[PDB]
């Protein structure tokens, strides 16, 4: 048994001129190189996990004169493709 806490960096979002959303997903598993860059080394030593706590902080970087929006949502089904319209995206529980 072991308990660890960390704060990784998933990716940096990019501009999208089109008014339709452009999604970029990240499967949440400790042994996932796409999401975690440090937790994988310690997860390779274990074969089970349980996320006691989990949060996603979006840290702005653009100037104050940029429009558009940035949305973060969590889908508990890791195989479902991202929604195809804004309403479905916002209908996900906890989307902010």
- The Cα–Cα gap between 29 and 50 comes to 10
Give min distance, CB of 24 to a copy of itself, in A: 14
Instruction: Provide the binding-site residues for a copy of itself, judged by CB under 8 A.
Output: 2-4, 6, 8-10, 12, 17, 19-20, 37-38, 40-42, 44-45, 47-48, 61-69, 73, 75-77, 79-80, 83-96
- The Cα–Cα gap between 54 and 35 comes to 13
Give min distance, CB of 51 to a copy of itself, in A: 16
């Amino acid at each position: 048994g072991i308990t660890r806490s960390g704060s990784e960096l998933i990716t940096t979002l990019k501009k999208n001129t089109d008014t339709e959303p452009k999604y970029t997903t990240a499967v949440l598993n400790p042994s996932e190189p796409g999401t975690f860059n440090q937790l994988i080394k310690e997860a390779a030593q274990y074969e089970k996990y349980r996320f006691t706590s989990l949060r996603f902080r979006y840290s702005p970087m653009s100037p104050s004169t940029t429009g558009g929006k940035v949305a973060l949502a969590f889908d508990r089904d890791a195989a479902k493709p991202p929604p195809n319209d804004l309403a479905s995206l916002y209908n996900i529980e906890g989307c902010v």
